[PDB]
Amino acid sequence: SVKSEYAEAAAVGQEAVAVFNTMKAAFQNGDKEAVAQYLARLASLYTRHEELLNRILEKARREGNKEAVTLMNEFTATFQTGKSIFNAMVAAFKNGDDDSFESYLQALEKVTAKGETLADQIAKAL
Ligand SMILES: O=C(O)Cc1c[nH]c2ccc(Br)cc12
Known part of the structure; x- marks a missing residue:
């Protein structure tokens, strides 16, 4: 179901949180070889999450679930805000700009913290 697809997409989001928090510890410690690998891992996690959320949104649209479509449009817009901030972060790492x-x-x-009440609203809406 779309609801089990959302649980799967959400688990991927939680994998990114775990990796991101590990990556922050590595950055603080100056362990740039680890940071490089965590940034590759996070890109792949964000590209997966982004595609999965797009499938959920498209399915909610085909089902005519207007409330779920509204919430998923708001969340996928914010996802792009996060993704843009992540990409700038990658560029700063490349440039050596701590x-x-x-x-x-x-x-x-x-x-990410802000978009959590909406993430949990989407689970209940689908
Ligand atoms: O996860 C998405 O839907 C978009 C996305 C694509 N790449 C990303 C990198 C970081 C963060 Br936060 C979000 C993204």
């Missing part, structure tokens, strides 16, 4: 990396990291934590 100040920008720190900044983008906190922004990505706050963007």
